[PDB]
Structure 1
Amino acid sequence: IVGGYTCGANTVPYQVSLNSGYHFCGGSLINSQWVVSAAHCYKSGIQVRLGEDNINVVEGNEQFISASKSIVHPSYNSNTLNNDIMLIKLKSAASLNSRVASISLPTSCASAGTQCLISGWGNTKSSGTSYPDVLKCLKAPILSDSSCKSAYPGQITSNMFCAGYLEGGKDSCQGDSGGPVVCSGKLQGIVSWGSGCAQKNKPGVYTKVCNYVSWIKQTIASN
């Protein structure tokens, strides 16, 4: 997260880290045994880390649980990043508490101009690299479809939206992929891609979760 702030320990209790020997993506706990992340974050053998603040110190809020299933949307296309969503089933249910809690799925898609909370352990610089120890947060609004399409000609599908600031300075960034965009108390987005980070006229692009509520419920039910 570039231009963000320290969230505060366990203030984003649905934020998870996906670990493949190191932190590589975020995700969002949506019930005690399922996480939503980005399809491009797929790896076999993922360990999900819940309750994290300082991603490099064992502090005592943590639960580490292996994925038992990591399910990329079948229509994910790595060439276009369309349908950039994955469901991870935890091998055993997380114990839910004030520090480890699920986030609700949307009941409707978000509107342009709604403020959202974006979070992660990614890079905090737009030039060069600096990775934070603690979880970072960013308040950022949903941008109009037309401004998103104008910024990324020919690349924005109906399954994507932009959020952030056209003036630049505030964005998600490398290491944030898969993590949450929460608006109106609901999981509306998944950190996916962008041109650089925090550049002018290049806002972050996010998977549009509201298009997948039925898919999510059906995939959970059958797995």
Structure 2
Amino acid sequence: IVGGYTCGANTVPYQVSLNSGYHFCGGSLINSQWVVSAAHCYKSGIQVRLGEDNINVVEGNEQFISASKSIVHPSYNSNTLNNDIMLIKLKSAASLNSRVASISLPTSCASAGTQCLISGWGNTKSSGTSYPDVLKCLKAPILSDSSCKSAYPGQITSNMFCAGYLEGGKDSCQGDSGGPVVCSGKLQGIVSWGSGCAQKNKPGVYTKVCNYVSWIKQTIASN
């Protein structure tokens, strides 16, 4: 997160770190056995780390659980990042608590104007590179579909929304990928992509989770 704040230990109990020897992506716990992330975060031998603040220190609220199964969306296009969503089953259920907790799925899509919390261990600088150990937060509004398409011509499908500030300065960034965009207690977004970080007229692009609920529910019901 660029130009955000330190969330605070466990203040976002649904944030997970995807770990393959190292944090490489964010994720969101949606029940005791499943995480939602970005498809472009797919790789094998993932361990899900829940209850994390400092990802480089064991501080006492962690649960480390290996992924048993990953499922990229059937229609994921790695080239356009269309349908950038993925579900990961945990090898055992997480012990759900105040600091480790699922975030609800949307019943409807959110609108332009809605305030949302984006979070992740990604790079904190818009130029140059600095990775935080503790989780970083950003409050950002969903931007209109027309301004999103205008910022990114020929790239914004119906499965993406922009969130952030057109002035720049505040955005998600490298390492936030697959992480939560939570709006009014509901997971509305997954950190998908952007042109750099916090650049003017170049806000973050998010997977529109409301388009995927049916698939998420149907999938978790049979796996």
TM-score bracket for this pair, using the shorter chain length: over 0.9
Shift of 1:221: 1.0
Q: How far apart, in 2, do the equivalents of 1:97 and 1:217 lie?
A: 22
Looking at structure 2, the residues matched to 181 and 173 of structure 1 have their Cα atoms a distance apart, in angstroms, of 13
* CA RMSD between the two structures: 0.4
Specify every segment of 5 or more residues in structure 1 that has no aligned partner in the other structure, as ranges: none
Q: Distance in 1 between matches of 2:118 and 2:154?
A: 25
Per-residue CA deviations over 1:24-53 (Å, capped at 9, x if unaligned) read 000000000000000000001100000000
Q: Deviations over 1:10-34 (max 9, x none)?
A: 0000000000111000000000000
**CA offsets 1:177-219 (integer angstroms, 9 cap, x no match):** 0000000110000001000000000000000000000000011
After the TM superposition, list the runs of 4 or more consecutive aligned residues in structure 1 that deviate by more than 6 angstroms.
Answer: none
TM-score by length of structure 2 reads: 1.00
Distance in 2 (CA, whole Å) between partners of 1:46 and 1:70 is 9
Distance in 2 (CA, whole Å) between partners of 1:167 and 1:211 is 28
Once the two structures are superposed, what CA deviation does each residue of 1:114-138 show, in whole Å capped at 9, x if it has no partner? 0000000000001010000100000
1:123 aligns with 123
Distance 1:178 1:79 in 2: 16
* 1:161-188 deviation per Cα after TM superposition (whole angstroms, max 9, x unaligned): 0000000000000000000000011000
2:128, 2:34 → 1: CA distance?
Answer: 34
Gap runs ≥5 in structure 2? none
Equivalent residues, number = 223
Q: Aligned to 2:220, what secondary structure does the other structure show?
A: helix
Q: Which whole-Å CA distance do the structure 2 matches of 1:175 and 1:102 have between them? A: 21
Alpha-carbon distance in 2 for matches of 1:149, 1:98 = 38
Q: How does 1:65-80 map to 2 (within 5 A)?
A: 65-80=65-80
* Structure 1 residue 222: Cα displacement: 1.3
- TM-score, scaled to structure 1: 1.00
Secondary structure of the equivalent of 1:139? strand
- Inter-partner Cα distance in structure 1 for 2:195 and 2:79: 15
Task: Name the CA distance, whole Å, in 2 between partners of 1:99 and 1:193.
Answer: 27
Instruction: Report the 3-state secondary structure (helix = DSSP H, G, I; strand = E; otherwise coil) of the residue aligned with 1:113.
Output: coil
Instruction: Provide the C-alpha distance between the structure 2 equivalents of 1:145 and 1:164, rounded to a whole number of angstroms.
Output: 13
Classify the secondary structure of the residue corresponding to 1:219.
helix
